[PDB]
Design an enzyme around this catalytic site. Structure first.
Site, PDB file in Angstrom:
ATOM      1  N   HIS A  48       0.804  -1.216   0.000  1.00  0.00           N
ATOM      2  CA  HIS A  48       0.000   0.000   0.000  1.00  0.00           C
ATOM      3  C   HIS A  48       0.839   1.269   0.000  1.00  0.00           C
ATOM      4  O   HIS A  48       0.275   2.364  -0.129  1.00  0.00           O
ATOM      5  CB  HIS A  48      -1.080  -0.025   1.098  1.00  0.00           C
ATOM      6  CG  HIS A  48      -0.585   0.066   2.507  1.00  0.00           C
ATOM      7  ND1 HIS A  48       0.077   1.167   3.007  1.00  0.00           N
ATOM      8  CD2 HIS A  48      -0.759  -0.774   3.552  1.00  0.00           C
ATOM      9  CE1 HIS A  48       0.323   0.982   4.294  1.00  0.00           C
ATOM     10  NE2 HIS A  48      -0.170  -0.191   4.649  1.00  0.00           N
TER      11      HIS A  48
ATOM     12  N   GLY B 279       2.656   6.019  10.629  1.00  0.00           N
ATOM     13  CA  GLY B 279       4.041   5.889  10.232  1.00  0.00           C
ATOM     14  C   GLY B 279       4.678   4.565  10.588  1.00  0.00           C
ATOM     15  O   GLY B 279       5.824   4.313  10.181  1.00  0.00           O
TER      16      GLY B 279
ATOM     17  N   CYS C  99       3.667   1.499   9.717  1.00  0.00           N
ATOM     18  CA  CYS C  99       3.512   0.411   8.765  1.00  0.00           C
ATOM     19  C   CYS C  99       4.875  -0.074   8.300  1.00  0.00           C
ATOM     20  O   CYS C  99       5.802   0.716   8.110  1.00  0.00           O
ATOM     21  CB  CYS C  99       2.706   0.860   7.561  1.00  0.00           C
ATOM     22  SG  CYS C  99       1.008   1.255   7.967  1.00  0.00           S
TER      23      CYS C  99
END
Ligand code: CL
Ligand code: NA
Lengths: 306, 305
Positions: B41, B143, B145
């Protein structure tokens, strides 16, 4: 979202851990620049434990009586000295993995990460707090002496604890990195016992603020309290006194949530009186006291879930 | 003595964390050998996230559209491809700090350490469990991920989790390092929710053994039970079934303490039916289920890495 007992990443400390052997005793040391720090009781033998004279034990040692092993490599000891209850072994190699670091002596209520080690090798990392009675509630087995506690705010490792011994109640005692014990304890096997411990009130309040930041208000109430009335109540539950310094340091969390410090004190008073009635706060059925105001700001969002 | 929620030492993983930026999105990647792994993503805009065609979105990216930073060094991306929900960015340099490692997929009830990272920089480490509902109760902010979860065996790091998203109840969902989600979750902005969870019975029993080993014995009793009888109680309290394999795994703790598993099940039955009567176990007023039998044996015996 979420809220966990969060330690600092341990790598910068892992690269400093070594094994120190003197006689039949092996424990952990901390290798920074060209110095290895470890508990001075490494020089004791079985008879020496009750009333060791460390000056007399140490004068009988040469540099080559100390075996220091960094992974598979033997370091050569080229000098030694004692500072309070720590031994400092000068070695012929500066640790190439030495991080930026400092030594800090902490106050009760402060938290830190512990890297538990055996034979110079790390086993695991967890968070601790210096209890009001100057013990820590660690997880330490035989051979863990010399394991250290630390914080890493802003890329610099602040070393604040070196592990020395376990007391009869199963809690732990140690020194700063200058070798001064926390609390009244001594590195002798004479009978010693921790004082009655108390709950770190300022930390409980910080954690209640964390619960509000993360979205839960069920425990608040419409009341307030004076500081003195709060302390009169809290001490009846073996809570530490809340000082104006503590009120001041809670200011930022109070501002972020819109809940005045003394209004949160009133919530805590009611929780002590009532319990949680089958609810939990941040996944706990007890009031948690090992997160400081700084830890909550470190871990939680700057935006309250309103 | 003592018993703490203990994470593995994180140093071997810290040396693998990098920052990945694509467009306006910055998150974390895992640099092993000459490949950086991160959530796919990263390539999406918020519009794309509503209903993304990752195949089509990726064909339009070039290598120079991926900015990978290891500390203060830019790594040059020389290829890019997708594996399930993970993007693999081939870089021109093998990570010299790559540890011995494997990718493993864990099962619900198993625990692991999370290295929470922001902007490619490790920030904290904590221990989690894969819940029966395939979420984790993590602690993650925007932040995070691409942060990873792992276990260690001697010198080999087994990577088992990469963080992808937060669900509305504040719990977390992610993938294995081959990009397969744990749980029925997808990497798109659509309505998703954690399912009803259950308690990990074998882990609660392990923690009761840890408590006995550390001197907390008040919940022990003279009674025993059978697997069939105890499992009827487990179901009533939304506990996972206990299997014979779970009993076998706890065998070492039963021998060490003198409390057979079904004997401890009788203790757990009574705790479920009566509560703790104001007492605590290892400093908890709840029945802890995020220690596995292995975690208890490892911590009580001092295994190193
Ligand atoms: Cl302090
Ligand atoms: Na029993």
């Amino acid at each position: 979202s979420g809220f966990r007992k969060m330690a600092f990443p341990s790598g910068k400390v892992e690269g400093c851990m070594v094994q120190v052997t003197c006689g039949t005793t092996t424990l952990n040391g901390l290798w920074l620049d060209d110095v290895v720090y470890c508990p001075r009781h490494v020089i004791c033998t079985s008879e020496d434990m009750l009333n060791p004279n460390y000056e007399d034990l140490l004068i009988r040692k040469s540099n080559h009586n100390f075996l220091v092993q960094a992974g598979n490599v033997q370091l050569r000891v080229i000098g030694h000295s004692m500072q309070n209850c720590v031994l400092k072994l000068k070695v012929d190699t500066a640790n190439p993995k030495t991080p930026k670091y400092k030594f800090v002596r902490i106050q009760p209520g402060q938290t830190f990460s512990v890297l538990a080690c055996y034979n110079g090798s790390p086993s695991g990392v967890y968070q601790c707090a210096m209890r009001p009675n100057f013990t820590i509630k660690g997880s330490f087995l035989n051979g863990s002496c010399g394991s250290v506690g630390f914080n890493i705010d802003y890329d610099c490792v602040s070393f604040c604890y070196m592990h020395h011994m376990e007391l009869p109640t199963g809690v732990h005692a140690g020194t700063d990195l200058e070798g001064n014990f926390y609390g009244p304890f001594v590195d002798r096997q004479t009978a010693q016992a921790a004082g009655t411990d108390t709950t770190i009130t300022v930390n409980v309040l910080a954690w209640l603020y964390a619960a509000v930041i993360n979205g839960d208000r069920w425990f608040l109430n419409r009341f307030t309290t004076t500081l003195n009335d709060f302390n009169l109540v809290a001490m009846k539950y073996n809570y530490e006194p809340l000082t104006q310094d503590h009120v001041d340091i809670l200011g930022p969390l109070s501002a972020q949530t819109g809940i005045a410090v003394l209004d949160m004190c009133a919530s805590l008073k009611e929780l002590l009186q009532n319990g949680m009635n089958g609810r939990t706060i941040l996944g706990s059925a007890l009031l948690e006291d090992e997160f400081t105001p700084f830890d909550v700001v470190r871990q939680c969002s700057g935006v309250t879930f309103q």
